[PDB]
RNA sequence: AAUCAACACGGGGAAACUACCCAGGACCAGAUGUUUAUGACUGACAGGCUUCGGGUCUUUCAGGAUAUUGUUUUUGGUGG
């Protein structure tokens, strides 16, 4: 366990995953959401985002 | 100590995790959404469900399983968290509740006709202008094929969808294949009930 | 009587402070923590004791020793029934029993 | 799994005291409340479930372990405590 | 006496306009003297298809942030009472100057 | 993925991780259903083997039931 390669500023750090997804394919870091897009768009209306 | 941006987004992200949590606990109690009140030191949350007795049985032990699960997750202090419950009047017209009734049946091997026209009758008699029920996936054959059962009338377009139309999507895993359940329910406007204003289609002329 | 020595250990394991191994029981005495360090009638009369008595003097104190080996083992939660060999009590209706062995 | 002994007790006490422990779904993740790797509470949690001492509910990459009737009777046997004896208070 | 600022923030405008009415209403009762900040559109522009298939179409998700600032001279006694609205998705930061 | 409706598309601007692929070397996340307190299993200094080493090996100290052997099958899988 405790993977020894550093991962400070790195794509596969554990912060960088989609929180819901657990996967990192297509991540939204802006406004500190840290959520994958497919994962995002299922549950965007709950967060208070809306189409206009 | 946050920005004016982040206090909105943290509270949004709080709510959506909280709501996906209380899908998976309160399936038996019959969940119907919630509201979150945020204060710097105090948090008050209204859970809403049909079977309010099923909480209060065993002198309110079931709520204290949930309340610790919230408290330990976000590491909030007790006293500073303040959960209530409040009952659903008219279970007929809430979408998440009636989804669960159609989920309850199709596990226990009722035909899909009879499962829909159970709830689609129960919605309309309770008090609603229309409702639609879709049961998408694999019954009988190797190909999947779509049932759609509708009554009343059901508005699909514009802004006026968002105000009037309640809806709820889900799925049932089975021995054979993954079905999808899907129930849209349109409402009547009340005079200041619990929508207020009428549709932008309709107008009413006074009598002379 | 030695039936009520089992009532002492049943709680001590869950007290909970415990030493089972000869090695764990030695370095319990040396490092200055154990209160009440037990042995039995097992081999070889003085071999256990010299390690203990020699061992026992540095830690200080002695405790009543229960014979048969098996009796010490049964109370500890050992069976699914191996010899206790030695029993160690450290740190510390349990307080009702131990007025025999005293504060 | 090999756990160390001292960390093992203060998990099963944090289980027994609270009733619900939360742990990140992700393994090799530092754990709050009790500090350790997040493999440690997670893998013991599914051991209890098989025996049937707790219920597992999983949401948003977080695992919740709500402790049932049998596990309350078990952990009095383990820690050696009188009955009554957590977070079912009213 | 430490002329105090409220700063009222919201996602939704109807839920805001209740709280502004109350916190302006209560300065009528207490009689404390009473003194719109520009709103943000947090536009996040995700590709709406999951896979790489199909014509590249993009949903636009504006979260809106309405923000108002009342402020007044008030003596710590009177201000404790006014602060205590409680609405969904509204915030009120109190700020001493 | 292959006319439009594949080909600055998979938000796919891959130095590592991401990563599935290739060459070496570790780990058990082997859940739950005969051995062992007289040590079941576990951790490591220096110097050898060695890409680099408590993977192995010559020494020999540190811990303490969280077990071992066989039988069941969980769980995990960017496998189809």
């Amino acid at each position: 366990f405790v993977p020894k390669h550093p991962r400070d500023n790195a794509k596969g750090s554990v912060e960088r995953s989609c929180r819901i997804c657990g996967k990192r394919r297509g991540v939204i870091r802006q406004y500190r959401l840290n959520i994958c897009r497919r994962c995002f768009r299922e549950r965007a209306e709950l967060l208070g985002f809306k189409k206009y | 100590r946050c920005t004016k941006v982040r206090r909105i987004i943290e509270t949004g992200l709080f709510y959506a995790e909280l709501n996906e949590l209380l899908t998976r606990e309160l399936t038996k109690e019959g969940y119907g959404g919630c509201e979150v009140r945020q204060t710097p030191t105090r948090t008050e949350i209204i859970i809403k469900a049909a079977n309010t007795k099923e909480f209060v049985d065993n002198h309110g032990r079931r709520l204290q399983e949930v309340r610790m699960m919230i408290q330990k997750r976000w590491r909030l202090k007790e006293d500073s968290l303040e959960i209530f419950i409040d009952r659903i009047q008219r279970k007929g017209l809430s979408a998440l509740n009636q989804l669960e009734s159609l989920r309850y049946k199709l596990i226990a091997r009722i035909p899909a006709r009879r499962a829909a026209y159970s709830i689609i009758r129960f919605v309309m008699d309770a008090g609603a202008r229309g409702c639609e029920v879709a049961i998408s996936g694999k019954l009988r054959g190797a190909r999947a094929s779509t049932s759609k059962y509708k009554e009343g009338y059901m508005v699909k377009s514009g802004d006026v969808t968002k105000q009037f139309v309640t809806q709820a999507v889900g799925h049932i895993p089975m021995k054979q294949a993954t079905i999808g359940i899907r129930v849209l329910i349109m409402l009547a406007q009340d005079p200041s009930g619990i929508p207020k204003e009428s549709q932008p289609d309709v107008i009413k002329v006074h009598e002379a | 009587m030695e039936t009520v020595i089992e009532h002492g250990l049943h709680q001590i394991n869950l007290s909970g402070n415990v030493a089972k191994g000869i090695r764990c029981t030695i370095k319990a005495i040396l490092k200055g923590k154990a209160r009440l360090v037990l042995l039995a009638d097992d081999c070889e009369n003085k071999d256990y004791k010299n390690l203990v008595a020699g061992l026992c003097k540095k830690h200080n104190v002695k405790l009543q020793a229960v014979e048969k080996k098996e009796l010490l083992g049964r109370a500890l939660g050992l069976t699914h029934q191996m010899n206790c060999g030695a029993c160690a009590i450290i740190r510390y209706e349990l307080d009702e029993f131990r007025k025999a062995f005293d504060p | 799994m090999y756990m160390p002994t001292a960390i093992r007790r203060r998990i099963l006490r944090c289980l027994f005291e609270n009733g619900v422990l939360c742990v990140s779904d992700i393994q090799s993740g530092t754990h709050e409340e009790l500090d350790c790797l997040n493999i440690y509470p997670y893998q013991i949690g599914r051991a209890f479930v098989t025996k049937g001492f707790c219920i597992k509910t999983y949401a948003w990459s977080h695992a919740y372990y709500t402790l049932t009737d049998k596990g309350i009777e078990y952990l009095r046997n383990y820690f050696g405590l009188p009955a009554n004896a957590p977070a079912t208070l009213r | 006496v430490q002329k105090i600022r409220l700063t009222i923030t919201s996602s939704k405008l109807p839920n805001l306009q209740r709280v502004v009415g109350n916190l302006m209403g209560k300065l009528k009762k207490g009689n404390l003297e009473v003194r719109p900040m520009p709103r943000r559109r947090l536009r996040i522009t995700t590709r709406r298809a999951p896979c790489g298939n199909g014509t590249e179409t993009y949903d636009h998700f504006e979260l809106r942030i309405y923000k108002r600032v009342i402020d007044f001279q008030g003596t710590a006694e009177a201000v404790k009472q006014v602060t205590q609205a409680l609405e969904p998705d509204v915030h009120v930061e109190v700020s001493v100057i």
Side-chain angles (χ1 to χ4, degrees), chain A, chain B, chain C residues 8 16 19 21 28 32 34 40 53-54 65 73 75 77 85-86 88 100 103, chain D, chain E:
Chain A
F1 326 127
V2 196
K4 302 197 297 306
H5 189 71
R7 302 180 168 78
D8 283 300
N9 297 117
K11 203 172 282 259
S13 298
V14 305
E15 184 156 47
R16 297 272 282 279
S17 302
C18 168
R19 45 183 44 168
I20 301 66
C21 207
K23 299 300 293 176
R24 61 189 58 74
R25 187 149 256 191
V27 174
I28 300 163
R29 283 166 62 176
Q30 71 193 317
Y31 318 118
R32 311 207 191 180
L33 289 157
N34 287 136
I35 302 186
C36 165
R37 83 189 219 268
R38 307 186 184 56
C39 303
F40 181 88
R41 195 171 166 285
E42 283 192 50
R43 53 186 79 81
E45 186 58 37
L46 293 164
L47 302 168
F49 288 78
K50 272 181 186 175
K51 301 178 197 175
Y52 290 117
Chain B
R1 180 51 169 180
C2 281
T3 55
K4 302 284 176 190
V5 176
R6 275 197 297 176
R7 289 179 170 165
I8 299 162
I9 287 160
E10 193 178 15
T11 301
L13 213 53
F14 184 87
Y15 177 86
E17 185 166 36
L18 183 136
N19 203 86
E20 188 56 67
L21 179 49
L22 305 170
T23 305
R24 311 204 186 285
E25 312 317 311
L26 314 181
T27 315
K28 298 168 279 183
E29 285 90 308
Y31 185 54
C34 55
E35 318 162 346
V36 172
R37 203 145 277 92
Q38 271 266 328
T39 309
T41 65
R42 180 214 312 168
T43 292
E44 304 187 339
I45 311 173
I46 290 166
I47 309 309
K48 299 186 283 183
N51 298 311
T52 53
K53 70 190 176 62
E54 195 163 28
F55 283 102
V56 181
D57 285 19
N58 298 259
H59 60 78
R61 193 167 62 76
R62 183 54 169 169
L63 188 58
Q64 300 297 103
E65 293 164 49
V66 172
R67 195 182 172 285
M68 202 78 208
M69 199 148 43
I70 304 303
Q71 191 177 298
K72 293 287 285 190
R73 173 54 185 75
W74 288 275
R75 307 168 56 189
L76 303 173
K77 208 178 176 196
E78 89 301 319
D79 115 277
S80 281
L81 193 69
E82 288 170 22
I83 294 176
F84 308 130
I85 57 175
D86 284 81
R87 74 187 297 285
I88 301 296
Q89 298 192 333
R90 301 167 288 175
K91 73 203 295 194
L93 49 58
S94 55
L96 291 164
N97 223 88
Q98 294 293 127
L99 184 76
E100 199 265 297
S101 191
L102 183 52
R103 191 166 205 169
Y104 195 89
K105 295 152 185 291
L106 297 169
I107 297 155
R109 310 203 185 184
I110 313 312
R113 169 57 50 72
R114 192 172 178 180
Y117 274 85
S118 178
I119 65 155
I120 219 170
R121 182 52 173 172
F122 194 90
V123 169
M124 215 78 80
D125 214 314
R129 301 300 303 175
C131 37
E132 183 165 43
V133 177
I135 301 161
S136 310
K138 188 169 163 172
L139 298 86
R140 306 186 168 285
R143 72 178 77 75
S145 289
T146 310
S147 302
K148 287 173 68 166
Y149 304 112
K150 199 168 89 77
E151 290 194 320
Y153 63 98
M154 177 49 63
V155 175
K156 282 274 171 61
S157 170
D159 180 45
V160 74
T161 317
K162 288 191 81 178
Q163 196 171 28
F164 282 76
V165 180
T166 329
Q167 54 150 39
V169 195
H171 60 91
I172 299 165
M174 300 196 162
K175 65 193 179 160
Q176 194 159 30
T178 310
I179 298 171
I181 315 304
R182 187 164 195 162
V183 179
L184 322 179
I185 300 159
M186 189 165 159
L187 306 172
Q189 91 289 2
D190 292 305
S192 308
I194 62 105
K196 290 198 170 56
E197 202 185 313
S198 58
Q199 293 163 297
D201 192 89
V202 180
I203 57 165
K204 193 191 288 189
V205 186
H206 285 68
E207 199 187 72
Chain D
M1 47 154 46
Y2 183 97
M3 207 129 170
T5 50
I7 188 62
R8 191 169 187 76
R9 297 290 301 285
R10 63 146 167 171
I11 293 291
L12 275 84
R13 199 178 160 182
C14 197
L15 175 47
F16 185 73
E17 186 70 53
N18 303 142
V20 187
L21 72 99
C22 72
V23 45
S24 290
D25 181 324
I26 322 296
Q27 314 298 211
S28 308
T30 170
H31 192 292
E32 296 56 2
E33 282 282 8
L34 66 81
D35 94 64
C36 53
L37 281 58
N38 297 358
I39 63 109
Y40 288 124
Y42 186 55
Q43 295 300 112
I44 66 173
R46 67 146 181 177
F48 286 42
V49 195
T50 323
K51 318 176 195 297
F53 292 49
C54 33
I55 295 58
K56 176 170 64 58
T57 64
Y58 171 84
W60 273 48
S61 163
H62 261 280
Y64 303 112
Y65 286 116
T66 308
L67 188 67
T68 203
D69 194 60
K70 294 185 167 189
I72 298 155
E73 193 163 39
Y74 176 79
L75 294 161
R76 292 177 192 182
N77 209 306
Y78 197 98
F79 277 69
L81 308 65
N84 58 65
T88 64
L89 299 164
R90 313 183 175 180
Chain E
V1 277
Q2 65 170 6
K3 45 170 280 191
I4 300 175
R5 293 176 55 186
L6 306 171
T7 308
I8 316 175
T9 309
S10 179
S11 302
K12 296 191 281 264
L13 206 77
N15 282 308
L16 183 63
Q17 285 172 328
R18 293 158 201 174
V19 176
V20 172
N22 292 19
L23 297 169
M24 192 125 292
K26 284 205 82 85
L27 300 176
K28 202 169 183 182
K29 296 206 302 198
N31 198 5
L32 276 180
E33 274 196 343
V34 72
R35 191 184 172 191
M37 305 309 312
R39 69 112 176 283
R40 296 172 69 82
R41 274 167 278 183
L42 306 185
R43 203 169 164 187
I44 296 165
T45 66
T46 64
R47 187 186 153 99
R48 73 204 298 180
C51 51
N53 188 265
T55 324
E56 68 209 90
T57 49
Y58 283 76
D59 237 309
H60 298 305
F61 290 115
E62 301 187 344
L63 189 137
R64 297 178 169 284
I65 306 171
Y66 315 124
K67 219 202 85 155
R68 311 301 181 80
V69 172
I70 301 162
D71 57 298
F72 61 100
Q73 301 186 319
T75 196
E77 291 185 308
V79 179
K80 307 184 174 183
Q81 312 182 17
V82 182
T83 61
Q84 324 164 359
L86 213 57
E87 202 70 47
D89 64 278
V90 173
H91 306 277
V92 177
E93 194 188 290
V94 184
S95 296
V96 177
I97 54 168

